[PDB]
Amino acid sequence: GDCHKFLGWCRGEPDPCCEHLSCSRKHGWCVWDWTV
């Protein structure tokens, strides 16, 4: 049950991003919070 870090697939995945990250649909992966 490893989480998905930055630039990691999320769409469809069982668990959400790792930490301080938001699943980005535009790119298709989680991105930095402070960044976005």
23 contacts 32 by C-beta, under 8 angstroms: no
Contacts for 26 with CB less than 8 Å, ≥ 6 apart: none
Residue with token string 């630039």 = 7
d(CA 14, CA 36): 23
31 contacts 25 by C-beta, under 8 angstroms: no
Quick one: CA torsion of 10, 14, 15, 18, rounded to 10 degrees? -40
* 3-state SS assignment for residue 1: coil
d(CA 18, CA 10): 10
The domain segmentation of the chain, as residue ranges, is 1-36
Way the structure was solved: NMR
Pair of tokens at residue 25 = 């649909």
Q: What is the DSSP string of 13-36?
A: -SS-BSSSEEEETTTTEEEETTT-
End-to-end CA distance of the chain: 26
Query: For residue 11, what are the β-bridge partners?
Result: none
